[PDB]
Amino acid sequence: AVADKADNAFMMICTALVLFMTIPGIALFYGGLIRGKNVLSMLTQVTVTFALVCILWVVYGYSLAFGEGNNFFGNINWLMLKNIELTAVMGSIYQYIHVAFQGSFACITVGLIVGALAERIRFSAVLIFVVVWLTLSYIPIAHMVWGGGLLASHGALDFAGGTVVHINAAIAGLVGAYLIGPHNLPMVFTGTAILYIGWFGFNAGSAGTANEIAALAFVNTVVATAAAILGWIFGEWALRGKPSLLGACSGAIAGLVGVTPACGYIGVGGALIIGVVAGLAGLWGVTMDDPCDVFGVHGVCGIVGCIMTGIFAASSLGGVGFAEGVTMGHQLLVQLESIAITIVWSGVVAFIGYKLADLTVGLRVP
Amino acid sequence: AVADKADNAFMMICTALVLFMTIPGIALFYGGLIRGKNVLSMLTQVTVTFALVCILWVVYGYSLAFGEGNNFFGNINWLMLKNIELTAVMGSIYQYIHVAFQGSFACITVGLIVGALAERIRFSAVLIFVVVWLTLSYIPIAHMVWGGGLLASHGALDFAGGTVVHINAAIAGLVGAYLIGPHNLPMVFTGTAILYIGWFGFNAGSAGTANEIAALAFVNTVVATAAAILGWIFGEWALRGKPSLLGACSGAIAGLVGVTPACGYIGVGGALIIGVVAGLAGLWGVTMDDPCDVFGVHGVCGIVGCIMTGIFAASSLGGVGFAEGVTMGHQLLVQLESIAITIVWSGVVAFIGYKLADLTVGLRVP
Amino acid sequence: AVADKADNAFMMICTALVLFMTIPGIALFYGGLIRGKNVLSMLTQVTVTFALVCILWVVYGYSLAFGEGNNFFGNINWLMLKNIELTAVMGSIYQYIHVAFQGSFACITVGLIVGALAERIRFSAVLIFVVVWLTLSYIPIAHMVWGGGLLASHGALDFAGGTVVHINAAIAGLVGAYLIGPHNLPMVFTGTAILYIGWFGFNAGSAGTANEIAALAFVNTVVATAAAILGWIFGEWALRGKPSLLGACSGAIAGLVGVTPACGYIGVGGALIIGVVAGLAGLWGVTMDDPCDVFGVHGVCGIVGCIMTGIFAASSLGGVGFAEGVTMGHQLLVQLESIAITIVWSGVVAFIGYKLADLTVGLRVP
């Protein structure tokens, strides 16, 4: 295996783009949603847990997520990237770029949880939760889906992390909101816009190469986001009598989340439909407690996107086609099972992480 | 034709960069220029018409702009990108990337109009105008210049859209301001800075490849922007006795607009001269009604850049050279004719789009 | 020598990223640190001196920095990029891209000085200082380190500009603060986040190619930044009893500065250690007059990073290995000598630039 420098270049820039999604995208997103007096402490928690994730990732996280082991975790042979030759190749890129790309996914997933709950949670408590949860939820689920583990080995389809990122974080957020118990819309908009732009590295980069699947993922991201903005805004216009900015921004996130598992597997007709459905699903979600509506958008649209990936991957619907020997009904069942496993896995581990913080330092911010 | 993955990578990142120019660049630019109480509604209109453009682009816009047809429009054989193989190659990149790149140009052009006028226009009215105007002005002009139509076939020079983007939008904006009848400078600056960075994807990406013409376009963008900042600020310092931030930011946009048609055709000596002249032209423009000075900068500097492309493309002036058999005088005439056609075409269609909104929903915001 | 289009693409995007660091990164960083009433004038000075640097760079700066001459400066054979064929290749990229990449380093270095002092300095005075200082400090030091001059020829290690950018600017800033005599933390955070993302083009781009050294520089940037955030925040938590946002952001800059000279030469274990030490060094620095703590972070962490590059480059410590015939003790001595030369060179020239402004227009803002 030799590294292709074009893919190297692509994947380094895509990594910078996914890092951009956390620092400052999600921070500004939540920054505009929470009360003014809580913004500074939230930005600090997002910055510091971000740093924590990057360090834990390189120390053991990448090895346990991406090393070969069992169905659930990898190994500890790549501690501090030991035994990874600088010139080692993973896919068509230097493995070091693969480390950085996959790490940036860990970052945004944790950022999604921490930004939503930072307002409510004690600082030392969130550090404890991130350690437990990254280690016991993010790493194994990443392994199961993208490290050749359980879900992958059953053919689960999840191009860029409807399960690993979105449902995983949504449930952890809901569990936290439950245990624990917009001031600036131009900032919300700015954070959303940065998330949007970053999400091209997230979705297109998940191809691992600057090929036609990256191209397809890129075009589907544009399409599903636009469709979800319009779906949300129409639903809002039909219901409230007027569109709002928060609605437009929420619609955009909804489409982005919806298309995340699907983007490299579906055609543009499917991205449009997933977009519309995700935007309206998101609107339904937030209408029907959910901290900064993390689940209403990431959770509901994550589930919707994962299921619809099992439909719209079909050749007959413009997608790339199911794997050899797989029917739509079989794929749908695998998508459903993948979503169920992710919900229970993340829920149990988040519960454990939050309880441990609470038993040691106390959860609620003094 | 085989896709080069280096060009694939380059052009996907350049597309993300041009998308960045609208979401959030132009939105923050206008956001800082208009009254505080109008900002939210403007951001909503920019976000939603952006979404609309992306959807119309993939549904029929790309096909009608880039399909082969006549001198004025393409065809409807690529509706929803039907009959475009995923592995289809356009130039040296996957055609799907070409769709996304060209679409992002449609977005920023509409963003330039909608951001300037959102404050004044009814929401449903702007949706109507965007449909009419994208379909009947943007698409045909894109076709004429970049889809092998009228202007291209006469050898018009317009590397990145002095006519298609800048003059097109400026006139539509002026027509709207006429029919219809800075609060936050750090936001203006931030929007300008984002437009600047995005504009590297806009200008250098227009080469379609990461070659020496992309390199040249990139260097000319840096140079013409810097020269226009200094030209504007000196003119302002000579006139008002002091430079201002809005002046510096306007100077930057002026240079960027000026160099847009020229950047891949001229040498750095020419970029410097175009820069200075565009900055001083911009300053003159805004000095001598023009909504958020859209025309004073995009219109005047667009015309100036298009004309000066017909001079500075000459080999003798450091440019790449006129096409075979073309003299400077002949090229100048083609540039002038291209500008005239674009002004009248955009003006008539914007008038039609605004009148239709006004006859159906009413133009002015209740 | 033929240009590799993958490296072309990479290096054009990296240049856009470094430009992003100034426009708007450092401007927003300082914008949030200085009093509200000084922000507009500071943003104007950053924008205009940025433009000035870009123009001086293309006119003579690139030629005098990167042309072949003596140990201290290049030549004037590339005035306005004359005698540089468009298809000329430097390393594995078109030389025009090398011009733009190196120019963007000049920009951020000047931005670091001007942003810190703009509040205090007369506008015409800063223009004078930038001309003198770019020409007589930045250019020769760039030449000595990266243009085959004195420091390079003695084997100084400085991957991305611990000396050329960070120490150079810190000293110029200290000299200015001496001669001359946070309002918005979400803005500080946003500027820091943009600096962070841009810094991937800065560090990884300094490889000049999308190879395994770019990959290594990229991963070390993530690691050293995260380690420095944690180092600073722990030191702050140990001292003040609580972490702060300004602390977290300062920690990030500290790590980024620290790893700058080292990132392409060290392993991830070394990046972690440099990170921690840089964060704690930065915290010590700002604790023990220093305009917007430019030296406390850029100066102290620059020195720390340059020294630690002479340790952590060793094969035995996970680095790439010292050059043939070089021991750790010899390398350390060269690092120390490089830092001393840079401090004295920049100090003397900044003194001269500030005195000349002061004798002609007066330094202090009326």
Side-chain angles (χ1 to χ4, degrees):
Chain A
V2 71
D4 189 302
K5 291 205 294 187
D7 295 340
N8 283 340
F10 185 59
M11 290 300 304
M12 280 185 289
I13 307 307
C14 285
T15 306
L17 287 172
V18 181
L19 294 170
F20 195 37
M21 287 175 84
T22 304
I23 303 298
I26 199 58
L28 290 185
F29 181 85
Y30 288 126
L33 283 184
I34 74 185
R35 275 237 283 141
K37 63 151 208 125
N38 293 318
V39 174
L40 299 190
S41 153
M42 178 279 297
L43 298 176
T44 308
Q45 290 201 13
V46 164
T47 302
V48 174
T49 58
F50 169 75
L52 177 60
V53 167
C54 293
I55 294 301
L56 300 175
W57 187 249
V58 169
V59 174
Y60 65 74
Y62 176 76
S63 181
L64 281 162
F66 288 95
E68 185 181 312
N70 51 68
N71 271 325
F72 302 96
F73 56 86
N75 60 63
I76 49 142
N77 302 144
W78 297 335
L79 257 42
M80 284 295 276
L81 311 186
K82 199 189 173 203
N83 306 309
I84 298 179
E85 294 264 69
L86 190 39
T87 49
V89 171
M90 179 73 77
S92 52
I93 62 174
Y94 287 121
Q95 181 164 19
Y96 263 57
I97 303 172
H98 184 254
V99 177
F101 185 73
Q102 292 297 347
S104 68
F105 276 64
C107 291
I108 185 57
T109 305
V110 166
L112 290 177
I113 305 161
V114 168
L117 293 173
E119 190 175 36
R120 320 177 185 208
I121 195 172
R122 188 192 291 270
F123 197 103
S124 64
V126 79
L127 296 174
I128 294 165
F129 166 81
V130 165
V131 175
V132 176
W133 192 85
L134 181 83
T135 308
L136 299 180
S137 195
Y138 184 85
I139 286 160
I141 291 170
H143 187 76
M144 288 191 276
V145 179
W146 295 326
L150 191 65
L151 306 181
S153 84
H154 283 255
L157 290 185
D158 189 358
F159 198 75
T163 61
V164 183
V165 179
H166 300 301
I167 297 172
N168 211 1
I171 298 295
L174 270 194
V175 166
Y178 159 76
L179 289 182
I180 295 160
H183 94 274
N184 195 336
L185 285 163
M187 185 174 295
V188 174
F189 167 83
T190 298
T192 305
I194 292 177
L195 285 163
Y196 173 69
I197 301 303
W199 218 297
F200 296 102
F202 188 97
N203 281 2
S206 285
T209 172
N211 67 358
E212 79 282 358
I213 299 312
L216 175 63
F218 195 109
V219 173
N220 290 338
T221 305
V222 172
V223 176
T225 306
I229 292 165
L230 301 172
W232 193 302
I233 286 296
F234 157 80
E236 199 186 23
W237 210 329
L239 264 48
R240 315 279 147 210
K242 64 194 178 207
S244 71
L245 181 58
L246 178 62
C249 295
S250 298
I253 306 304
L256 287 161
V257 170
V259 80
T260 284
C263 56
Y265 300 127
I266 69 182
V268 300
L272 203 154
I273 296 173
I274 287 172
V276 169
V277 174
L280 293 164
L283 174 60
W284 173 85
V286 307
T287 298
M288 311 321 191
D289 91 276
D290 175 24
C292 298
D293 296 333
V294 71
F295 186 81
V297 182
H298 293 259
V300 178
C301 306
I303 297 175
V304 161
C306 289
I307 299 173
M308 299 186 91
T309 307
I311 291 162
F312 286 97
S315 298
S316 59
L317 296 171
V320 301
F322 302 113
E324 216 179 63
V326 184
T327 65
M328 184 183 286
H330 175 95
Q331 196 60 60
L332 280 177
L333 177 53
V334 171
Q335 301 304 103
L336 300 169
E337 288 168 333
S338 297
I339 293 153
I341 286 153
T342 302
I343 289 174
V344 177
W345 196 296
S346 186
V348 173
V349 180
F351 187 85
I352 294 161
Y354 287 121
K355 281 284 166 183
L356 186 70
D358 199 30
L359 297 176
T360 64
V361 291
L363 268 173
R364 275 182 292 271
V365 60
Chain B
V2 71
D4 189 302
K5 291 205 294 187
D7 295 340
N8 283 340
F10 185 59
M11 290 300 304
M12 280 185 289
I13 307 307
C14 285
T15 306
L17 287 172
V18 181
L19 294 170
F20 195 37
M21 287 175 84
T22 304
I23 303 298
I26 199 58
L28 290 185
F29 181 85
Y30 288 126
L33 283 184
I34 74 185
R35 275 237 283 141
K37 63 151 208 125
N38 293 318
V39 174
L40 299 190
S41 153
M42 178 279 297
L43 298 176
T44 308
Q45 290 201 13
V46 164
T47 302
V48 174
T49 58
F50 169 75
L52 177 60
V53 167
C54 293
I55 294 301
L56 300 175
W57 187 249
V58 169
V59 174
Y60 65 74
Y62 176 76
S63 181
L64 281 162
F66 288 95
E68 185 181 312
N70 51 68
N71 271 325
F72 302 96
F73 56 86
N75 60 63
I76 49 142
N77 302 144
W78 297 335
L79 257 42
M80 284 295 276
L81 311 186
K82 199 189 173 203
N83 306 309
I84 298 179
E85 294 264 69
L86 190 39
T87 49
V89 171
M90 179 73 77
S92 52
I93 62 174
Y94 287 121
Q95 181 164 19
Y96 263 57
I97 303 172
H98 184 254
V99 177
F101 185 73
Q102 292 297 347
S104 68
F105 276 64
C107 291
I108 185 57
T109 305
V110 166
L112 290 177
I113 305 161
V114 168
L117 293 173
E119 190 175 36
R120 320 177 185 208
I121 195 172
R122 188 192 291 270
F123 197 103
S124 64
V126 79
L127 296 174
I128 294 165
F129 166 81
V130 165
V131 175
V132 176
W133 192 85
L134 181 83
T135 308
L136 299 180
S137 195
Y138 184 85
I139 286 160
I141 291 170
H143 187 76
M144 288 191 276
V145 179
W146 295 326
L150 191 65
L151 306 181
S153 84
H154 283 255
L157 290 185
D158 189 358
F159 198 75
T163 61
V164 183
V165 179
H166 300 301
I167 297 172
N168 211 1
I171 298 295
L174 270 194
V175 166
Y178 159 76
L179 289 182
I180 295 160
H183 94 274
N184 195 336
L185 285 163
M187 185 174 295
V188 174
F189 167 83
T190 298
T192 305
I194 292 177
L195 285 163
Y196 173 69
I197 301 303
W199 218 297
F200 296 102
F202 188 97
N203 281 2
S206 285
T209 172
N211 67 358
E212 79 282 358
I213 299 312
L216 175 63
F218 195 109
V219 173
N220 290 338
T221 305
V222 172
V223 176
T225 306
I229 292 165
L230 301 172
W232 193 302
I233 286 296
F234 157 80
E236 199 186 23
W237 210 329
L239 264 48
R240 315 279 147 210
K242 64 194 178 207
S244 71
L245 181 58
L246 178 62
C249 295
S250 298
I253 306 304
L256 287 161
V257 170
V259 80
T260 284
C263 56
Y265 300 127
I266 69 182
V268 300
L272 203 154
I273 296 173
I274 287 172
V276 169
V277 174
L280 293 164
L283 174 60
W284 173 85
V286 307
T287 298
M288 311 321 191
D289 91 276
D290 175 24
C292 298
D293 296 333
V294 71
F295 186 81
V297 182
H298 293 259
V300 178
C301 306
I303 297 175
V304 161
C306 289
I307 299 173
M308 299 186 91
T309 307
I311 291 162
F312 286 97
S315 298
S316 59
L317 296 171
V320 301
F322 302 113
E324 216 179 63
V326 184
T327 65
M328 184 183 286
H330 175 95
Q331 196 60 60
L332 280 177
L333 177 54
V334 171
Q335 301 304 103
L336 300 169
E337 288 168 333
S338 297
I339 293 153
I341 286 153
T342 302
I343 289 174
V344 177
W345 196 296
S346 186
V348 173
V349 180
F351 187 85
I352 294 161
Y354 287 121
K355 281 284 166 183
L356 186 70
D358 199 30
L359 297 176
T360 64
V361 291
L363 268 173
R364 275 182 292 271
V365 60
Chain C
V2 71
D4 189 302
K5 291 205 294 187
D7 295 340
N8 283 340
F10 185 59
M11 290 300 304
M12 280 185 289
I13 307 307
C14 285
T15 306
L17 287 172
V18 181
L19 294 170
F20 195 37
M21 287 175 84
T22 304
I23 303 298
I26 199 58
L28 290 185
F29 181 85
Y30 288 126
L33 283 184
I34 74 185
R35 275 237 283 141
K37 63 151 208 125
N38 293 318
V39 174
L40 299 190
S41 153
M42 178 279 297
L43 298 176
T44 308
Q45 290 201 13
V46 164
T47 302
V48 174
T49 58
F50 169 75
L52 177 60
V53 167
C54 293
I55 294 301
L56 300 175
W57 187 249
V58 169
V59 174
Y60 65 74
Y62 176 76
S63 181
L64 281 162
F66 288 95
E68 185 181 312
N70 51 68
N71 271 325
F72 302 96
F73 56 86
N75 60 63
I76 49 142
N77 302 144
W78 297 335
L79 257 42
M80 284 295 276
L81 311 186
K82 199 189 173 203
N83 306 309
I84 298 179
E85 294 264 69
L86 190 39
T87 49
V89 171
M90 179 73 77
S92 52
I93 62 174
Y94 287 121
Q95 181 164 19
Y96 263 57
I97 303 172
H98 184 254
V99 177
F101 185 73
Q102 292 297 347
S104 68
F105 276 64
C107 291
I108 185 57
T109 305
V110 166
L112 290 177
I113 305 161
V114 168
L117 293 173
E119 190 175 36
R120 320 177 185 208
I121 195 172
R122 188 192 291 270
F123 197 103
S124 64
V126 79
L127 296 174
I128 294 165
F129 166 81
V130 165
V131 175
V132 176
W133 192 85
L134 181 83
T135 308
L136 299 180
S137 195
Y138 184 85
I139 286 160
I141 291 170
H143 187 76
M144 288 191 276
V145 179
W146 295 326
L150 191 65
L151 306 181
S153 84
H154 283 255
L157 290 185
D158 189 358
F159 198 75
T163 61
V164 183
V165 179
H166 300 301
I167 297 172
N168 211 1
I171 298 295
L174 270 194
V175 166
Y178 159 76
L179 289 182
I180 295 160
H183 94 274
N184 195 336
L185 285 163
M187 185 174 295
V188 174
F189 167 83
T190 298
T192 305
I194 292 177
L195 285 163
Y196 173 69
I197 301 303
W199 218 297
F200 296 102
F202 188 97
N203 281 2
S206 285
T209 172
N211 67 358
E212 79 282 358
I213 299 312
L216 175 63
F218 195 109
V219 173
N220 290 338
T221 305
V222 172
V223 176
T225 306
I229 292 165
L230 301 172
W232 193 302
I233 286 296
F234 157 80
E236 199 186 23
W237 210 329
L239 264 48
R240 315 279 147 210
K242 64 194 178 207
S244 71
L245 181 58
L246 178 62
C249 295
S250 298
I253 306 304
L256 287 161
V257 170
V259 80
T260 284
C263 56
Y265 300 127
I266 69 182
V268 300
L272 203 154
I273 296 173
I274 287 172
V276 169
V277 174
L280 293 164
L283 174 60
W284 173 85
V286 307
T287 298
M288 311 321 191
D289 91 276
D290 175 24
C292 298
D293 296 333
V294 71
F295 186 81
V297 182
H298 293 259
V300 178
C301 306
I303 297 175
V304 161
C306 289
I307 299 173
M308 299 186 91
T309 307
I311 291 162
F312 286 97
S315 298
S316 59
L317 296 171
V320 301
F322 302 113
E324 216 179 63
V326 184
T327 65
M328 184 183 286
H330 175 95
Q331 196 60 60
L332 280 177
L333 177 54
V334 171
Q335 301 304 103
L336 300 169
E337 288 168 333
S338 297
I339 293 153
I341 286 153
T342 302
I343 289 174
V344 177
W345 196 296
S346 186
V348 173
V349 180
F351 187 85
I352 294 161
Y354 287 121
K355 281 284 166 183
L356 186 70
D358 199 30
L359 297 176
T360 64
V361 291
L363 268 173
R364 275 182 292 271
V365 60

